[PDB]
Predict the structure of Beta-glucosidase I.
Amino acid sequence: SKFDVEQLLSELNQDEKISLLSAVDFWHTKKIERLGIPAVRVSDGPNGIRGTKFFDGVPSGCFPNGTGLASTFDRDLLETAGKLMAKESIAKNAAVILGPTTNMQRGPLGGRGFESFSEDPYLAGMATSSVVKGMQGEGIAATVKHFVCNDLEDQRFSSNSIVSERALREIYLEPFRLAVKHANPVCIMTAYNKVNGEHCSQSKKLLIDILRDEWKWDGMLMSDWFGTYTTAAAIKNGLDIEFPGPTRWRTRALVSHSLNSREQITTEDVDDRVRQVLKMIKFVVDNLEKTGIVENGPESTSNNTKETSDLLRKIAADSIVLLKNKNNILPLKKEDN
Amino acid sequence: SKFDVEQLLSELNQDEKISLLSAVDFWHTKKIERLGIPAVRVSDGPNGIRGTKFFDGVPSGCFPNGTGLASTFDRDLLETAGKLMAKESIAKNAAVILGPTTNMQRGPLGGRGFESFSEDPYLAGMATSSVVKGMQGEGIAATVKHFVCNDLEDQRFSSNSIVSERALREIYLEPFRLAVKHANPVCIMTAYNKVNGEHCSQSKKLLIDILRDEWKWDGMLMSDWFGTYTTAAAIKNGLDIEFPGPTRWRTRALVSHSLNSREQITTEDVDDRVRQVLKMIKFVVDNLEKTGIVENGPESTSNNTKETSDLLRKIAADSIVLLKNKNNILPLKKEDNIIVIGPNAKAKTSSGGGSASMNSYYVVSPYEGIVNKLGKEVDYTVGAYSHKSIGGLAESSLIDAAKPADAENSGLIAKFYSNPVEERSDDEEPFHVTKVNRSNVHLFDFKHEKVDPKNPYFFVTLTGQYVPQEDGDYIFSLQVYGSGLFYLNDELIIDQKHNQERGSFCFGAGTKERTKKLTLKKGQVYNVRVEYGSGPTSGLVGEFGAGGFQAGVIKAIDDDEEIRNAAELAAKHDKAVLIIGLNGEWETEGYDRENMDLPKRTNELVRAVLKANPNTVIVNQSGTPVEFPWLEDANALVQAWYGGNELGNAIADVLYGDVVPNGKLSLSWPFKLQDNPAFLNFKTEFGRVIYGEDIFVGYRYYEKLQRKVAFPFGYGLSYTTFELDISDFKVTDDKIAISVDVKNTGDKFAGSEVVQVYFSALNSKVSRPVKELKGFEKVHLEPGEKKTVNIDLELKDAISYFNEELGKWHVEAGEYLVSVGTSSDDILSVKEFKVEKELYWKGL
Amino acid sequence: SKFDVEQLLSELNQDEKISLLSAVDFWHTKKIERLGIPAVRVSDGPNGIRGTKFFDGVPSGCFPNGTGLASTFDRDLLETAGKLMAKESIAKNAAVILGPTTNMQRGPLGGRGFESFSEDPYLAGMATSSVVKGMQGEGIAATVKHFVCNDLEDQRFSSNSIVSERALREIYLEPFRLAVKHANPVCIMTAYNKVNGEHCSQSKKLLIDILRDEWKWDGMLMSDWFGTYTTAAAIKNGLDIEFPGPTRWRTRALVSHSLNSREQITTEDVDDRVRQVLKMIKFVVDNLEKTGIVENGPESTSNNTKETSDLLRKIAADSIVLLKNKNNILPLKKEDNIIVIGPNAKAKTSSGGGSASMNSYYVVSPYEGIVNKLGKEVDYTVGAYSHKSIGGLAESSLKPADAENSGLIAKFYSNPVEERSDFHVTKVNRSNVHLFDFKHEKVDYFFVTLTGQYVPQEDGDYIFSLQVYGSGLFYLNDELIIDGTKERTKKLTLKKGQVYNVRVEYGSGPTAGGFQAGVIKAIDDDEEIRNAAELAAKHDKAVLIIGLNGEWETEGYDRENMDLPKRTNELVRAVLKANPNTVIVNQSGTPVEFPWLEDANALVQAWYGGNELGNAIADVLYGDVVPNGKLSLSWPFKLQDNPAFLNFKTEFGRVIYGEDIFVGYRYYEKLQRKVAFPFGYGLSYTTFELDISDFKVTDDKIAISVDVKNTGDKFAGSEVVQVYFSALNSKVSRPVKELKGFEKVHLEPGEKKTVNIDLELKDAISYFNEELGKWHVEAGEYLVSVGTSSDDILSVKEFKVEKELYWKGL
């Protein structure tokens, strides 16, 4: 490795440090030319890589949705799916994939119920873990999302999920715990909502007491997009990087006015966050040989092969669940009318 | 008028509402055209109106500084001063004045100590209330600042004032309660600091519980400039408007995201702030036909008249306190052969430094005042230098040396560019060009379509010709906030670009002074050029304002020789008039004084002059106490403060007896810094300042310790003599009426005396000060004349203390003493009385 | 060991667990026979062991008071004193001493200022550490008290000490930190007051975050007496045991009901407190072989020996500070013609008032010490009176003249004199009858009939006295003369030789208790001053003995001023005028103004000297002990000069520590305020000189060698080397200099010794960084100043520190 976190942290000035705490645009973090820190490209999503645009976007490989994926109950195939996701991401020159998604269908009506794995925490967590293992084995960073209790869409930027510690721990945190323990994801994205009255993106209990002190996970936390709600509390309480850019909550003037006015945060809090962003970047940079990712590089349809074709067909075929088959109606015969 | 607060509130959409919670620019609120809400202009400050800019600002009338004003002990005159300030504001088309200032000098070293009124909360409150009445009777809104406990400048943006509720209530909040009670200011500005751990500008206790729920005050709160530290808590907790614009904390995105995400605030909190801004604007609009204010109007000098000069001269003369006068040194007379000596003699120290300062119509130096009085030239010598830094370059240069030292030709030329000189095409035109008269180029609020308010990034090339008036060594200087290079005849003499070191310049945020002494030749023409980049240009890490710069030059001297010379010349005259003190760089917003000393060789000069000639009158200009080590040998001593535009005539008036000195000290004047209550806790340490003396501030401390001071609160001499006695006294169960007869016992001079009324509790179990000021009256008397003045007040006003345990003010049953005198140390007549109806109260 | 804490904790049932969390009675923890857990006896106090009774107390050895002890600046001697206190404790069968005390005299007027050690936290902490070592080396448990900021008496059960974290750390917690680090006290007693809003006895920050998580101290915390204020919070927040019993806050019902209702505490909270109580009993039980302590054992005077007497006399003599001695007035020669004068000359002011005082085997008055020294009768006159109230009746009351016919008899009764037809009997020797910890089968209301005969020794007026809580009547010759209360007096004329009958009918406090009936010979105040002056003029020398006493300085209230009482100052001025070669000996626990100081040519501060106080004073005055104490306290000229002048009262329930870190000499040096005598000052009968003779600094240690020499040629003597440090270029405001080391060295005339002082830099030069919440060793330049008082600096050394250090803990 030619990328050392502490050396670089000791070399960044305060303005550079603050600039690393937010993304520059929808999809990229902050290049620090003078120190050889590249911009890292991130892309959605949990079932294939979109790249940098919706409108006029580069065609890509779409996987089956998460609830179908989990229905394979097949860890080896989910790790294979993961690896193919990484190859897909490389063709889009994205170093970090925003997935997989593992909120919980506590009811069936969730807008994003299709996107996560399972109502069962063990299956959701092994599925997450296997997907992350395949992505990260190819040098590509995963982002398990969204931490935590983003289990419906209605008024999600303010929804307060009120949930006992027993349920929080056994149902909603559990697939994150299993993912952290078995797969060590490089990133986690915080949810839009609150848990028990506190926005997750500034919850010290979630982002520090659990993720850091209890579980000892050492990856980078990013907000969901615009899912940041204060300048100082989010910095103090463990949110490493705000997305997307340009920053709302972390302009140089806001952060540095807070520091110099002794409002809530100290330069140590700022260092703690920068330190985590630098670890993510280290992961990307140390893997640049393996992935061949190009900073700000083009986006291609280059993984559009027969091999990717056959694998998406397999994964899809294995997700299918036969619920009824009375009197041998199935399988069909080719000459059946 | 038809400006209707509730109708407009109901008609504003959410974006227009957010846009009312922050200023647009440094000085103006948000116009909303479709609804007829005009932009309102506000202006500094508490001793005169600067208007919309520091650099190239429109001249104005500078009043004496606050501790000078309060030393008049004259409510009618202070109210008259507020009216004139309103007339001054109308000339700048400012509808709101940012003042008066009434923080408390709990110790003497505060950088803004000059600016506020008094260590005594009653004198401070009644002065504030008289100024506010004067402004607001003319239709112009006051803004009492800074709420609260901004009692020193060290680290003021983070400084935590740790103060008990009793002291908070009896000393610091009290001048604001009095102002609110008697004058109802339209606005109040929050302080930069914290109180007991919370920034004032987001403190629910200060902004809502006290101001609104307790006191029922209905005016508007604005932040100090940049004095806002969160988005949602400041809005929830009662801060109505953030200054300056463009907003940092209250963009449409920040506030609506907070609202939409249920983070801390509701639409109701936003409406409550907006309604208070609308009430301020309604005051302005209700008063438009009366004031004639023009929205975004021009700024003029239309108030620079004989009437204004006369009134400023009177106010300054009456601020002056005579401290010693033995052996009939004073009053001076035409026949005395006098020499005028000293660093402040030809200086123009009109005001303290910072937001209270301004560009004046003119300022009469004390030397000029004396020349004006005698109708001829007066002998002079400088004696010693006392400047903190070197200015005077723009003030003595010409654009074109071969032309006459004209108005049009005097000064320097500032040319403004988008690009630095090292880079631009030779055909890049300046975007702005300005003739510069003062060497301090202060660009804080500089505004131009080529300058981005969120990143005020630009360059200035400053040029002219300097022609020395003496052969010898000259010291040139450069100070910057931003970046600068000082060239002489196209040779780089001073580099303020590389390896900058932080110093005093620009409120303590800029660089130290760098200088270059060069041997210069008389009458030879030298080309002075400064290349400057504003704050954001210079590659110094952080978020910067536009900043400023000062290029200066001064004639080197033989300092020892000049002291000898001063002393020799003083022996050859009948009397010397020695003019000394601090100035607006020693006493300024931004940092506190390091000690109570007069600067540089001042004391050496005074000791030499007093030895050579004991018939010397000393005139001291400062806003707060200085140690006078040679005090015992000074037979004649006058405290002139910073007397504003007419300072020099006001001083001559008092020295010659055309005005008979009638001021009384608004501050205790200890012998030594180590005697003061705040000696150990006047610095922000680990982010805090513990008000360890609690209620024992100023004379409350000294009397309680029986510590002698050089001069006590309320002290001041006259050319005549006075005597007084209580002529009637009546106590009901709820009131005190006291009549006092005062007589001028002298047979030569008319003059005014200040009757001071103090109270003392005689046997309480609660610890109090020995006595507290609760009434004063100033009375003018001809020789031999006697008048009765009356002082009636409620007992609740006179003898309450704040019971911290109960959370309430308390009039305690018991024996009391009323003491009446002409200083806190000169009590002439007393009376005991009994109170048996106790009273507990809160509010006003 | 037959005592296993964790095994016991696992075997105790819940009720037994709850019963261990409070004392049984005033002095004893709970016996649990089932498990072999004995009752442990504790006893006051820091200057001698009182035992289980105030009234009818078993006599004991009273030591000099704390500010006198600290003025020895002698660790070894203080260790010796704690060892002797242990032996005194064993003789009362008390396994734990309620001492030493180390609150801080932030102002001079604290009613218990006499009782603690020093305004300097390093001297206070090393004195504490030394006493505790001496106690515990004998197998007796120390209880360092009162934790923390119990620095005045006014309204102490509720007073909120509001104090910044920097001053809390550097000044108030610091002597406890040092005591813990160096001596590991088995117990600490919590204060009555609050700190920053929270009663100390339920403050998690103090009791757990600091004492347990940060310092790792594993002793037992007990409340001061009745200084518990909640049931559940105090248990949750680290108060191990409530005293006295019977429990108020921790009954079985209160505690188990909180547990069973999920109100605040858990069974784990309870076990945590029981575990600390068991560790304390384990120390006592593990030591039983060494101490011989008998459970619920008898109390004796067995330690009243020549060895104890000579050691008390030595400790008192070395406590004494010689403040002025012009014209070689001192030492006195045994052939000097002298008169002794003054209100304290025949007084026995052995201690200050309240919790730290006791019934002594004997007290030698200063007058008796001088008679003992000279071996003959000494001329005397009282000069002036200075008593707060009249006592002295029991002490001078009774044909036979016996030392067993001496005093009054107290006969306790169920009902009033008004109604009795016609249970406890006690021989009373002191007029103040203090019944607070009094107990009998026939009591919870009770009544007392106090009788004897009084015989005047002079003709004329006598003033009889009575004070009560809260009912009594005084009869002389069966006629009613006098009807907590004020003092009420009756003046009567009597006749030398004539026997009168004294009878006091008293009713108990509900009508706990107490009363004092006294008598005094009335004097003509003006004439007695003239008389002392006239007499002083007719002798070569006068020795004038003045001061306060245990009624002016006492637990329960602070002093109102720093004045000497009544006509003392007038007396002193008259005597100094009549004879300039008058030596003044002053007894007080804290400073008093001496307005006549300029005219006083010889002046000795004796403190309150305990049983041998008067022989120690004689030892110093005649030169058999060469004065060697230094002031443990700053002695300002006037009360108003003091840093706490404005904030030394509980007002609206609080006290703001406005001076912050600037306490005692840290304040005066910073202001450059002159005092009458500074911290660390004391004179000798010989001269000394010193020089730093070696110096060495590393990254972590400072080692200093100092040569000291007695340059006189007549007296041997001890000098106290005091080592102060200063930051010369710190970013942070600090005191001019700070005491961080001292050594006491005995030197024959002409003799020279080298003393060594080794310290870790972190001990020498840290300040507490309030913003970071940590101690900081800051890089920069520093000065070590060595001298024989805080002003008399004789040798200095500059040194650089390059390595920074942030630390917490010990």
User: Anything to note?
Assistant: Chain C touches chain B through 27 residues (CB under 8 Å). Residues 391-521 of chain C form a domain with the Jelly Rolls fold (CATH 2.60.120.260). Chain C has 19 helices and 35 strands.
